[model samples]
Target: LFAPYSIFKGKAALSVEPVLPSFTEIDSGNLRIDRRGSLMMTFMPAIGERKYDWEKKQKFALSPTEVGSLISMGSKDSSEFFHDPVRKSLSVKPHADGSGYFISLSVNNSILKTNDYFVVPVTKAEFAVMKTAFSFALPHIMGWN
Candidate 1:
C-alpha cells in the first residue's frame, strides 16, 4: 500500500495523488482522506451548458462506512446512483471485468443549477491507490491506530 503523499496535522487531512498518464487529464483532481475519515474527491466537468461556471469544481465526500458500501454497490452490473441529496449524486458503473469503474457525478443543488455532467474514469491501478489511501487513514480516523 502507498502512504499519503501529504498530511496536514492541524486539519487532519491525508492527501494522495494517483499516478496518472498526464496532468492534462487530471490537473486539479485529487483523492483526500478528510478530517472525518471520509473519502473525498473533486469532480470537474469537461463541458457545460447554461449558467454556472463550468470550470468550477465540486467536491463530494463518502464516509468510511459509505466507502465500504460502495464496494458492494459497484459489484452489481447495472449502474447505481448514490445521491448525496444536496450536493451531488454519484452514478457508479463497474466494468465487466471488475478492473475499473465509470462514475457520473451530477450536480443536485438548485442554486448552482446546470445540466452539466462530469464523467470520471477510474482505472484498476487508480482504484487501488484510492483503496490504499482510505485504508491508510481508516484506523487513525477511527482512533484505533
Candidate 2:
C-alpha cells in the first residue's frame, strides 16, 4: 500500500525496508528493494556522488532495508539538522580524511557550514553491483521507466 506522507510537498518519497523481498525463483540475497521500491541486485552500486548548491533534490532509490540505516548514519553526521523538528533537508558528502561519508538533514533556517563533510564508502560487493546497474537502474527509477 502507498503511504500518504510518501507524497509530501508535491514530492514522492518512500522509506527503505529493513528486509528485502523474498523471490521464490530469484535469489532474495542477491536482490533487494531500494527506498524507491525498485528491484536491485547485489551487484548494483550502493552509493552515488554529486555536488550541488544547498537546495532540495529529488528522492533516490535505495534498498528498503538500507533506508533506516542510512537515515541513522546521516542523522548522526548532521546532528544539528536532524535535531531540528521543522526542517526537511538531507545532504551527504564525503569526508576529507577518507573515512566513511556523512549525511546531513536540515529543516527551516538551520544552517550547516560548508566544512561539514561525510565519507561514504561502499562494500566491494555493493560497488560491483552498483556499477553494473547504474546506467539502467538510475534512469528507470527517476521515471524513465
Candidate 3:
C-alpha cells in the first residue's frame, strides 16, 4: 500500500513534488518531508497493535541531499542548502516538462531564494530505483505489475 503524494503542497503555481525513496518502506502509508527538516511525524493512522498512536519515522531526519540528500548539512562559515552538495544538483535542460526544472525550498523560518532543488544524481546503481519511481510504480497500481 503506497500512500503516494505530490511533494509540493500549498504553495505557488504548483502544489507538491515527489516522494523521497528513503521514507518509502513498501506497503505502508505515505509520508512527506516538510521544509522544517523534522525527524518526528504523526502516524497516518494506527493499525495492527501499537498502543501509542504517534509513530516516529526516524527515517524522517532527511537532509534533502541525502538525509533525504544528507540532513541538509550543518552550516560552516559559508553556507548553502539542500545539502544539495551546495553548488550542484542533478537536473536537465529547461523545458515545459517539470523534469528539468528548478525548485525552491524553505529553511529556518524565512523562505529561501531559488537554490535548493536537487535529484539523486543517479548514474547506474540507483537507476532502477529511479525507474521504479518514474516508470514502474504507476503501472503496478494500474495492473501492469
Per-model C-alpha RMSD: 13.3, 16.7, 17.6
lDDT of all predictions, in order shown? Answer: 0.53, 0.32, 0.27
lDDT of 1 at 120: 60
Clashes of each: 0, 25, 18
Candidate whose TM-score is highest = 1
Per-residue lDDT tens digits of candidate 3, residues 81-115? 32222233222222243223322332221234343
TM-score ranking from best to worst? 1, 2, 3
State in Å the error of residue 101, model 1: 0.6
- Candidates 1 and 3, the one with greater lDDT: 1
Candidate 1, run of 10 with poorest lDDT: 18-27
Comparing 1 and 3 on TM-score, the stronger one: 1
lDDT of 2 by residue, 1-145 (tens): 3221111111112222112232333365676534344432111111324333223332323433333333344212422223224334444444555443333333354355232222233333333333344433444444445
- For 1-145, candidate 1 gives per-residue lDDT tens digits of 3343432222122234322111122335564333344466556543333223324666566655656655444444444446555656766577888887676667766776755466666666665666676666555554456
Off by over 4 Å in 1: 1-35, 47-55, 71-85
Model 3 misplaced stretches (Cα beyond 4 Å): 1-114, 132-134, 141-145
